[PDB]
Amino acid sequence: VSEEEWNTGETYTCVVAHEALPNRVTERTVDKSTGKPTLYNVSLVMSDTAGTCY
């Protein structure tokens, strides 16, 4: 894939079919931001941490 088409985003999926896979088919995916990135941007927020929990 041309380098302009990868630095946009563009999720690609690889589907394989084989006689020992569960539903006979599996698939993976990658884009610019998931696979081997140079930037990990977590942003987590916890809220109502006291709460009333049973």
Binding site: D48, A50, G51, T52
Partner: protein
């Protein structure tokens, strides 16, 4: 009155006679002479009640 008077032990009488009922009706009132102290706790609102917003 003054509050030492009701606190004293002296009784207080309300004396009324009526026309049809000629006899005086004595109401003799006093505080019952003859003790612990309270322990005020203050309990704060539940968490459930505040989660109703």
């Amino acid at each position: 009155i003054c509050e030492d008077d009701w606190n004293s032990g002296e009784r207080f009488t309300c004396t009324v006679t009526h026309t049809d009922l000629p006899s005086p009706l004595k109401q003799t009132i006093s505080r019952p002479k003859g003790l612990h102290r309270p322990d005020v706790y203050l309990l704060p609102p539940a968490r459930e009640q505040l989660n109703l917003r």
